[PDB]
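The record is kept unedited without comment:

——
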Amino acid sequence: DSFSLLSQITPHQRCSFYAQVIKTWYSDKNFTLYVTDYTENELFFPMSPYTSSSRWRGPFGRFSIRCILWDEHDFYCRNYIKEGDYVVMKNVRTKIDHLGYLECILHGDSAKRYNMSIEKVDSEEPELNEIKSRKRLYV
């Protein structure tokens, strides 16, 4: 249907959003992104500022969502989407993990049944103006 702020997404729905990539992690099974639009969601994991060792600089608290990418989504993004990039995720699915936190999932879809996509957004696009503005306010 249309785009949501990350504060508006709920579990077990299809949604679309713009976000900034905070963290990436590739593995032999999948590719993981942690993204934010600097809006808070009560089901996101609360990122701690106190962790003894971490390369995460922010945002802290419940402001970012983990996205797991498998199969073609992994192969496409794993050496392409980078920390600090802006992304637009379209028609992606949300779920709740074993511990109750929201996450986003992109399952391999060779049948092309669900129409999902993730693409990089050029940093000058106006749809990113609110993220940039909220980042300033968050900080």
Notes: The chain has one domain: 1-139. Residues 1-139 form a domain with the OB fold (Dihydrolipoamide Acetyltransferase, E2P) fold (CATH 2.40.50.140).
